[PDB]
Write an enzyme that holds these catalytic residues in place. Sequence first.
Site, PDB file in Angstrom:
ATOM      1  N   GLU A  16       4.756  -2.579 -14.531  1.00  0.00           N
ATOM      2  CA  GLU A  16       3.375  -2.924 -14.270  1.00  0.00           C
ATOM      3  C   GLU A  16       2.565  -1.914 -15.063  1.00  0.00           C
ATOM      4  O   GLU A  16       2.868  -0.726 -15.055  1.00  0.00           O
ATOM      5  CB  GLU A  16       3.044  -2.800 -12.788  1.00  0.00           C
ATOM      6  CG  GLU A  16       1.662  -3.344 -12.404  1.00  0.00           C
ATOM      7  CD  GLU A  16       0.513  -2.534 -12.977  1.00  0.00           C
ATOM      8  OE1 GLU A  16       0.656  -1.300 -13.128  1.00  0.00           O
ATOM      9  OE2 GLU A  16      -0.531  -3.122 -13.305  1.00  0.00           O
ATOM     10  N   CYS A  63      -3.800  -1.986  -7.674  1.00  0.00           N
ATOM     11  CA  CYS A  63      -2.564  -2.672  -8.000  1.00  0.00           C
ATOM     12  C   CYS A  63      -2.312  -4.001  -7.285  1.00  0.00           C
ATOM     13  O   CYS A  63      -2.782  -4.217  -6.143  1.00  0.00           O
ATOM     14  CB  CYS A  63      -1.394  -1.750  -7.766  1.00  0.00           C
ATOM     15  SG  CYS A  63       0.071  -2.449  -8.560  1.00  0.00           S
ATOM     16  N   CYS A  66       2.302  -3.871  -5.990  1.00  0.00           N
ATOM     17  CA  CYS A  66       2.456  -3.246  -4.675  1.00  0.00           C
ATOM     18  C   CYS A  66       1.118  -3.514  -3.983  1.00  0.00           C
ATOM     19  O   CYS A  66       0.378  -2.602  -3.609  1.00  0.00           O
ATOM     20  CB  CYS A  66       2.686  -1.750  -4.854  1.00  0.00           C
ATOM     21  SG  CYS A  66       1.278  -0.916  -5.657  1.00  0.00           S
ATOM     22  N   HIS A  70      -2.109   0.093  -0.934  1.00  0.00           N
ATOM     23  CA  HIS A  70      -3.368   0.843  -1.114  1.00  0.00           C
ATOM     24  C   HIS A  70      -4.396   0.530  -0.039  1.00  0.00           C
ATOM     25  O   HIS A  70      -5.159   1.404   0.353  1.00  0.00           O
ATOM     26  CB  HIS A  70      -3.993   0.633  -2.510  1.00  0.00           C
ATOM     27  CG  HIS A  70      -3.289   1.371  -3.608  1.00  0.00           C
ATOM     28  ND1 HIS A  70      -3.390   2.734  -3.765  1.00  0.00           N
ATOM     29  CD2 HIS A  70      -2.415   0.946  -4.555  1.00  0.00           C
ATOM     30  CE1 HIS A  70      -2.597   3.128  -4.749  1.00  0.00           C
ATOM     31  NE2 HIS A  70      -1.995   2.060  -5.247  1.00  0.00           N
ATOM     32  N   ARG A 461       7.643   2.491  -3.993  1.00  0.00           N
ATOM     33  CA  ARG A 461       7.854   3.477  -5.053  1.00  0.00           C
ATOM     34  C   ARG A 461       7.748   4.931  -4.585  1.00  0.00           C
ATOM     35  O   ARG A 461       7.972   5.869  -5.357  1.00  0.00           O
ATOM     36  CB  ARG A 461       6.881   3.211  -6.195  1.00  0.00           C
ATOM     37  CG  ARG A 461       7.341   2.113  -7.141  1.00  0.00           C
ATOM     38  CD  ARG A 461       6.193   1.434  -7.836  1.00  0.00           C
ATOM     39  NE  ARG A 461       6.631   0.150  -8.372  1.00  0.00           N
ATOM     40  CZ  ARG A 461       6.596  -1.004  -7.711  1.00  0.00           C
ATOM     41  NH1 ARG A 461       6.133  -1.082  -6.470  1.00  0.00           N
ATOM     42  NH2 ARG A 461       7.094  -2.083  -8.275  1.00  0.00           N
ATOM     43  N   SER A 484       3.752   6.750  -8.750  1.00  0.00           N
ATOM     44  CA  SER A 484       4.021   6.848 -10.179  1.00  0.00           C
ATOM     45  C   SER A 484       3.402   8.061 -10.854  1.00  0.00           C
ATOM     46  O   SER A 484       3.916   8.534 -11.884  1.00  0.00           O
ATOM     47  CB  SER A 484       3.671   5.553 -10.896  1.00  0.00           C
ATOM     48  OG  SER A 484       4.349   4.478 -10.277  1.00  0.00           O
ATOM     49  N   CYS A 528       4.793   1.883 -12.259  1.00  0.00           N
ATOM     50  CA  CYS A 528       3.581   1.090 -12.061  1.00  0.00           C
ATOM     51  C   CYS A 528       2.405   1.927 -12.596  1.00  0.00           C
ATOM     52  O   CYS A 528       1.944   2.880 -11.945  1.00  0.00           O
ATOM     53  CB  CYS A 528       3.391   0.807 -10.584  1.00  0.00           C
ATOM     54  SG  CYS A 528       1.930  -0.216 -10.229  1.00  0.00           S
ATOM     55  N   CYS A 531      -1.250   1.829 -10.974  1.00  0.00           N
ATOM     56  CA  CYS A 531      -1.222   2.639  -9.753  1.00  0.00           C
ATOM     57  C   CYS A 531      -1.416   4.094 -10.149  1.00  0.00           C
ATOM     58  O   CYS A 531      -2.342   4.743  -9.693  1.00  0.00           O
ATOM     59  CB  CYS A 531       0.121   2.507  -8.972  1.00  0.00           C
ATOM     60  SG  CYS A 531       0.115   1.262  -7.620  1.00  0.00           S
TER      61      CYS A 531
END
Lengths: 534, 267
Positions: A16, A63, A66, A70, A461, A484, A528, A531
Site C-alpha cells: 500500500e 489508510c 487497514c 485509525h 501491522r 510502518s 503500508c 499509514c
Amino acid sequence: SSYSGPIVVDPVTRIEGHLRIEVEVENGKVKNAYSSSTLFRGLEIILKGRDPRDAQHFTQRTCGVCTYTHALASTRCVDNAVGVHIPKNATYIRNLVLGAQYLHDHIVHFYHLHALDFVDVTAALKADPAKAAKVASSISPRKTTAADLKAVQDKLKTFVETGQLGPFTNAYFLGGHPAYYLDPETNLIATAHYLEALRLQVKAARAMAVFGAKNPHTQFTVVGGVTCYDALTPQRIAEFEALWKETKAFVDEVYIPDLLVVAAAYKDWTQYGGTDNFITFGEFPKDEYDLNSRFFKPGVVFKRDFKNIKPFDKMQIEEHVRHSWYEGAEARHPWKGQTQPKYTDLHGDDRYSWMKAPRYMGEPMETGPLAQVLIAYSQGHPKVKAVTDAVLAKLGVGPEALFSTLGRTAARGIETAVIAEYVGVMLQEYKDNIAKGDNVICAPWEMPKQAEGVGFVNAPRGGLSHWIRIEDGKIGNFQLVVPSTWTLGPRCDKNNVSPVEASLIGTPVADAKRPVEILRTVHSFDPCIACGVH
Amino acid sequence: LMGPRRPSVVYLHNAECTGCSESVLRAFEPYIDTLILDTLSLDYHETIMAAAGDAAEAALEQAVNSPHGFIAVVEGGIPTAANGIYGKVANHTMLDICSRILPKAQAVIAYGTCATFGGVQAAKPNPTGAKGVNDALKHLGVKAINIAGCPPNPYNLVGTIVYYLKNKAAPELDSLNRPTMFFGQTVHEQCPRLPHFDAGEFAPSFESEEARKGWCLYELGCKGPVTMNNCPKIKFNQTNWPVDAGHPCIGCSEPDFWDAMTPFYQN
Ligand code: SF4
Ligand code: SF4
Ligand code: F3S
Ligand SMILES: [Mg+2]
C-alpha cells in the site's frame, strides 16, 4: 556471474502506498539499503484547531487497507483524554470488528500480495490435475477432486492464450527464474486458492459491515461507545457468526496448510530478513484503561533476549527527522511533536524519506505479527504457544528459525489462526452479557477545555498510537505514530538503520533485472506507506 | 498486457489511502475475479500487479502506447504546490505522469472524493496544494467522469464502465461531472428514518432512548439533506450502511466536505 553495483525498485508494487527501495549489492548480496517513502499528505497539520470529535473521521483516511484501525485509535485517544469508561458492550463490538479486520487483512496479504514472489502461475498450466488433487487432499481435511482443479487450469489457459496477461504482464517468473522452486502440481494448488480467496475475502469484509457500517471505512464509533443498536439483535449476531465460521474454515483448511507447503518448499528462506528488537502494544482488552488486561499483552525485547521481556514505557517513544524531509534534526516525543515539511531531494543534506524515524530508547523496533507472536509466546500465552509449536513441528525447524522472512511470514499465519478462534470466545461472552440484561452501548462525557490523551491499537501491522493535546477545547496538537513508521521509516540521528533496511542486508540476488528476493523480505513486513507518513 | 478482445484499463495511484482500490476489490455479481479475467484487462495496478520497478514502468508504457487505446481510472488527488514535489512515483512528479498520460486516454474516470474534488489532503491549510483531476489539468483539456464517495460504492464504478463499454459515451452528468443515475438524489430522501424527521422526532444523543428507537439523527449532525449518493438504496457489502448502523452521514461525496460540513456533529 556475481553482480556488484546498485539496484533500484521504484515503484515497489503489491504494497500500500508509494515506496522506493535503493540497495547496494556486492557480489550477489545486498550490502546497503534505503527506504524512501515518496508521498506526503500532512494530516497532522490539517487537524490543528479543529474539533477533537472529528479527528477519527480524518485519521481513518490515513489508510483504506487497514481501514478500521485509525478510527479506533483516534476514538480510544479522545475517550482517554476525556476520561470516559465506555460500556462493556461497546468494548465487545469494537473488539469483534477489529478481530474480523485481522482476518480479512491477513488473508489478502498472503495470497494477493505476498504469494507471487513464491508461486509461478504459468507452471500451473503444465500440472497434472489428478495428481494435484491428490496432494491437495492429503494436507487438508477439505478434499479436492481432479475435476475441481481441472476447471481452474482451463480458466487460466484461456486467459494466457489471449496475449492479455493483465496483472501478470512482466512477472519476474515468466520464462523461468532461478528463485522459483515449486513444482507444477503445487503451483496449481496455490493458484486455485489465490482465486478462491478473492471471493472469500468479500465474506470476511462483510463481517465488519454487520456491526460497522461498511468496509472500507466504517462509521459506528464515537466518543463514549458505539452507535449500532442493531448489533444487539439476534439476527445481526447470527449473520456475523455465519460469516466468521466460513472465514475461519478457510483459515484452518486452506490458508495454514498452503503456508506450510510453501514454507517447506522454501525453508532456505529461514536465513534472511532477521531483526533484533521488537515492540507490541497488546490488544483485545477487558479494561480500556489497562494495557495488561488484553488477550495479547504489551512488551518490548532488545537483542532477541526473550527471557527479559521489558515493560512498555510510553514516554520513551520519540521520532527523528535528521534523515527525513523535515526542518532540522530534533527528535520529539509525540506530545511535543512537530510536522514541518522541508523538501531537499533524494539524499539532499542526507535526507531521503517523508517518514520520521521513531526510536524507543534510541533503538529501531520491528513491530507486527512477528513481535506480537514471539512476545506472547514467551509470556506463555496458551493458544499462541499451542499453534506455533505445532507449526514449527510440521516444518521441522527450531524456534531460532522465526527471526527471518520465513518466520515473519509464518507468524502472520499463526496469529490469524489464534485470533480466528478467539473471535468465537468474544462472541460467546458478548452473547452472554446481552442475555444478562445489559443493553447499553454508549456512555455520557464532557469536553475538557485542556487535556492530553493517547490511544493504543495493535493493528495487523503492529503498534499503533494516536496522541492529542487539547487546548481551549480545540485540537492544539495531534500526532500519529504508526506501525510502518517503526519498521519502514529511515535512519535516525545516530544513523542506526531501520528494521527493513537492516533485514535487507545479505539478501542474495540471483538476477538484478528481476530482484524477486528483495520483494520477498520487503513484502514480509506488509508495508503500508500512506499509514507511515500520513 | 494490451491486445484485442478485452478492453484495456490503466489504474493510477496519486495522493491516496487505497481505500478506493479496496472498495473495487469488494465487487459482487460480478466479482473481481470475473471482471479481471472475463470482462476487462487490468494492465496496470500497483496494488496487485506481479511486476515491479523497471518492469512495472515498462508495463505501463506498453499499455499507454497500445494501438488499441485504453480507459484510465484515477485514485487520489494531485499534489501541486512547490511544483508537484510532494508526490513522486519512479522519480516523476504525480503532476507530470498525469499530464503525460491522461490526455491520451479515451476516457478518464476519477474514482473517489480525492481524485474528484481534492479530498482529505486538500482540506485547510492544504500544505501540498492538492487538487482533483479536472482542477489540476483543465489547461490540458482533461475532463474526467467523477463518481464521488469516500470510498464510492463499487456498484457505481462497475455501472459506469459497463455503460461506457456498450456506448462509447458518458451517461449524463450533473454540475460536478457525476452520473445522474447514481448521484441524482440526496441520501436524505432515500433514508428509512425520514418519517421521524418529518415529525420533529430527533434523537438528542446516541445513548438516548430515542436513538435506541431509531429516531432521526439530524440534531446529531446528519449531512444527509445536502449530500448526493445512493447509500440507502444500494447499501454496502450487501448488508449495511451509515445511519442503519446509527451514525449520521458526514457528506463524504461532496466537494469541500472536510471544511464545508465540519463540525460533523453539529447542524
Ligand atoms: S476518497 Fe477516501 S477512501 Fe478514496 S483514496 Fe480518498 S481518502 Fe481514501
Ligand atoms: S437527517 Fe439524516 S438520519 Fe435523518 S431522515 Fe435525513 S438522512 Fe435520515
Ligand atoms: S457518509 Fe458517505 S457513504 Fe454515504 S451515508 Fe453519507 S455519503
Ligand atoms: Mg506522525
